[PDB]
């Protein structure tokens, strides 16, 4: 599924991400935009052979099992393919674990490089939340 901007903002809002660990909703929408372009089916292979999955490009190196990333972990205890649903619940639940961990949203490369330090409020402008 390719989410609309406000559609995704609303979904993230009702799943409790607004100001979760201090990260306002626009940060989460911005992260999803630059990770997956709002596409729940997005997958990308990393140089080390792990793969990023879904709307928030969750990495099999640490967070989910795909059975093809030797030595990796599965900290969200979930098959990576489960992070590709049209329903964002699994990705949000895993994201909340990731963001509470250590370096916060810096765990998402696209967030650090494209959202952090910018005015992210524009990402939720006009949305019915």
Catalytic-residue membership of 48: no
Q: Could you give the CA distance from residue 10 to residue 49 in angstroms, rounded to a whole number?
A: 34
Instruction: Pick out residues in 44-83 that bind Cl ion (CB under 5 A).
Output: 70
With respect to Cl ion, which residue has the nearer C-beta, 70 or 102? Answer: 70
Q: How far apart are CB 72 and Cl ion at their closest, in Å?
A: 7
Q: How far apart are CB 23 and Cl ion at their closest, in Å?
A: 32
At 112, phi and psi to the nearest 5?
-60, -45
Catalytic-residue membership of 35: yes
Would the annotation count 66 as a binding residue? no
In the bound complex, which residue of the shown chain has the CB atom lying closest to Cl ion?
70
CB neighbour list of residue 92: distance below 8 Å, 6 or more residues apart: 12, 15, 16, 17
Decide if 63 contacts 72 (C-beta within 8 A).
no
Residues that bind Cl ion (CB under 5 A): 70
């Amino acid at each position: 599924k390719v989410f609309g901007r406000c559609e995704l903002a609303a979904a993230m809002k009702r799943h409790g991400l607004d100001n979760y660990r201090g990260y306002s909703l626009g940060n989460w929408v911005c992260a999803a935009k630059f990770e997956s372009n709002f596409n729940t089916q997005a997958t990308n292979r990393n140089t080390d052979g792990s793969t990023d999955y879904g709307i928030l490009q969750i990495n099999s190196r640490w967070w989910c099992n795909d059975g093809r990333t030797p030595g990796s972990r599965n900290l969200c205890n979930i098959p990576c393919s489960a992070l590709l649903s049209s329903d964002i619940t699994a990705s949000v639940n895993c994201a909340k674990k990731i963001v509470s961990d250590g370096n916060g949203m810096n765990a998402w490369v696209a967030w650090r490089n494209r959202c952090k330090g910018t005015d992210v409020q524009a990402w939720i402008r006009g949305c019915r939340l």
